[PDB]
Design a protein around this ligand. Structure first.
Ligand SMILES: Nc1ncnc2c1ncn2[C@@H]1O[C@H](COP(=O)(O)OP(=O)(O)NP(=O)(O)O)[C@@H](O)[C@H]1O
Ligand SMILES: Nc1ncnc2c1ncn2[C@@H]1O[C@H](COP(=O)(O)OP(=O)(O)NP(=O)(O)O)[C@@H](O)[C@H]1O
Ligand SMILES: COc1ccc(C[C@H](N)C(=O)O)cc1
Ligand SMILES: COc1ccc(C[C@H](N)C(=O)O)cc1
Ligand SMILES: [Mg+2]
Ligand SMILES: [Mg+2]
Ligand SMILES: [Mg+2]
Ligand SMILES: [Mg+2]
Lengths: 257, 257
C-alpha cells in the first residue's frame, strides 16, 4: 500500500537534506532511525559542538577580528524601549511583543540596547565606534516555515567615519562569503540581504530621525541577521525548526528516535 | 570638606578592584574617569571580547574537550516543566518564576530541558551520556549583592557508568583549577561548592525520586554553576552587577563616563 500522509510526515522528521517506493513504512523508518542514531553517535564521538553555539562563536571571531567590540546586553528589557523605538499600535511589531510583568518585555530586537551602547561608548572610544551583539530575540509570529518565536540575532553597527553604503555592502559581502552562504543585496538608505525568497538580513545607513531619541547625532551603518536563517540555508534545512534552540532537533537531527 | 555619601557612591562606580583624602571630589572623579576611559580604549584596541561571552567560550571548550555534548535548548519553556520539577507553593522557587503568557515562563534552571535530553539521547548514544549547557536563566530575587534576576548558568550532567561522588568532585576540581578560581567543596548525595561565603555551585549525585517523572532510571552526577558568580570571584568585583549582561558595565568598567 501507499504510505499515509501521517507516515510520510514521520519519515520526513527523520529525513536529512543529503539522504539519497516498495518497502513498507516500518522498513523505511528503521533505516532512517539507524542513520540518525549514527549521525548523533558521530557528533558525540568527534566534535560535540552545537550548530547554533558554533555559528555564534564563528561570527564572534569574524567581527572581533574586524575591529568590532563584543557586547552582551540584557535580554529582558524595559517596555519603554519599545515605545522609544517608535513601535506604536500602527506597526506590526507592537502586536509581536512578549510582555513580562508590568514594566518589562523580552527584547524583539537588539537595537535599543545597542543605541544606548553607541551613545555611552562615544564618550570613551575613538571614532569610528564599531560594536556587535549576538543573542536571543523574541517575537510572536503566525508563520512557521521561516519564523521562530525564539530566535537569535546578530547586529553589527558602526558609527562615525566610513559609514557609507559601499562599506556596509563590503562587510556583508565579506561576512557571507566567509560563512559560505549565497546571497543578493537588494536596494535613510535601506538594503535587504536575500537568499532566493528568504530575507537573511535588513541593513541600514544612517542618520535617521529616530537617532535623536537615543542621543545619537553621527552617521552610521549596520545590519541585523537571523542565525537560524543562516543555518537553515547553510545546512539546507526544509524547516527553520531544525536550526532552533530545541528539544526536538539537535544539529538538525531528530531527537525523537 | 569630607566627601558626601553620594559622592563616594559615584567614585565607587568608577573604582576598579586593583586601583591603588585631601583632593576634592571633582579631582578624584576626573582621575578615575580618565583611567576607565583608558581601560575601555585598551579593550577596544586589543582583545575586544566581552567577559561573559569569553567565559562561556572557555567553559564550552573545557567540557567539549572532556567528552560532554554541547546543548542549546529553549529559554522560554512550558510552565508545566516547573510543576513537573516538583516546584509547588511549598518551595521558594515557586514565587521566583517570571511567567510569560498563560502557558510559558522564562526558565529559572536548565534542569527540565536537560532531563528531556538525557532521556532522548539514551536511545542513541553509548553509555555514559555526558551533556552540558550554558545560557540565560531568570529568577525574581530580593538580594542585590550576590543575585541577579537575569543570570547565566552552566550545567554539566553525566548519566550511566562512572557516576560517583569521586568523579563529580574530580570534574569540579579540574574545572575550577582550570579557571583559576579558589573553592571548597562542602558536603541523593548533595554538595555545595563555595568561595568563602559565596555559593558558586550546587552539585548532586543521583538517582533521586524526581527522575521517574522525567523517564530517567540510571545513576547520574551533575552540577550547576553561575557564570556571573565565577566572574565576580575571578575579577574581584564587589558587586555582581559588574559581571552581568548590562548597559551600565562593560567587563566591569562603568559605561557612565
Ligand atoms: N521570527 C523570526 N525568526 C527567525 N529569524 C528572524 C525572525 N524575525 C527576524 N529574524 C531575522 O532577524 C533579521 C532582522 O530582523 P528584522 O529586519 O526586524 O526582520 P523582519 O523585518 O521582521 N523580517 P520578516 O519577518 O522575515 O519579514 C531578519 O532579516 C531575519 O533574518
Ligand atoms: N539569582 C542568581 N544570580 C546569579 N547566580 C545565580 C542565581 N541563582 C542561582 N545562581 C547560580 O546558579 C547556581 C545553581 O543554582 P541553584 O543551586 O538553584 O542556586 P540557589 O540554590 O538558588 N543559590 P542561592 O540563591 O545563592 O542560595 C548557584 O550555585 C549560583 O551560582
Ligand atoms: C544598526 O542597523 C540595523 C540594526 C538592526 C536591524 C534589524 C531591525 N531593523 C532591528 O532594529 O532589529 C537593521 C539594521
Ligand atoms: C544535574 O545536576 C545538577 C543540575 C543543576 C543543579 C542546580 C539546581 N538544582 C538546578 O536544578 O538548576 C544542581 C545539580
Ligand atoms: Mg517579521
Ligand atoms: Mg527586515
Ligand atoms: Mg536562590
Ligand atoms: Mg544551590
Amino acid at each position: 500500500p501507499a504510505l499515509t500522509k501521517s507516515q510520510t510526515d514521520r519519515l520526513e522528521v527523520l529525513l536529512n537534506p543529503k539522504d539519497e517506493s516498495g518497502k513498507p513504512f516500518r522498513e523505511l523508518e528503521s533505516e532512517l532511525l539507524s542513520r540518525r542514531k549514527k549521525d548523533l553517535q558521530q557528533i558525540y564521538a568527534e566534535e560535540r559542538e552545537n550548530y547554533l553555539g558554533k555559528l555564534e562563536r564563528e561570527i564572534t571571531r569574524f567581527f572581533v577580528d574586524r575591529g568590532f567590540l563584543e557586547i552582551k546586553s540584557p535580554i529582558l528589557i524595559p517596555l519603554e524601549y519599545i515605545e522609544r523605538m517608535g513601535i506604536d499600535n500602527d506597526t506590526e511589531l507592537s502586536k509581536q511583543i512578549f510582555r513580562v510583568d508590568k514594566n518589562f518585555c523580552l527584547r524583539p530586537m537588539l537595537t535599543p540596547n545597542l543605541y544606548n551602547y553607541l551613545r555611552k561608548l562615544d564618550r570613551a572610544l575613538p571614532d569610528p565606534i564599531k560594536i556587535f551583539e549576538i543573542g536571543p530575540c523574541y517575537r510572536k509570529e503566525s508563520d512557521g516555515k521561516e519564523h521562530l518565536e525564539e530566535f537569535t540575532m546578530l547586529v553589527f553597527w558602526q558609527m562615525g567615519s566610513g559609514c557609507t553604503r559601499e562599506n556596509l555592502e563590503s562587510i556583508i559581502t565579506d561576512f557571507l562569503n566567509h560563512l559560505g552562504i549565497d546571497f543578493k543585496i537588494v536596494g535613510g538608505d535601506t538594503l535587504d540581504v536575500m537568499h532566493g525568497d528568504l530575507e537573511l538580513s535588513s541593513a541600514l545607513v544612517g542618520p535617521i530621525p529616530l537617532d535623536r531619541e537615543w542621543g545619537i547625532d553621527k552617521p552610521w551603518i549596520g545590519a541585523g541577521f537571523g542565525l537560524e536563517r543562516l543555518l537553515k540555508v547553510k545546512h539546507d534545512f526544509k524547516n527553520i525548526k531544525r536550526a532552533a534552540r530545541s528539544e526536538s532537533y539537535y544539529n538538525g537531527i531528530s531527537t525523537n528516535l
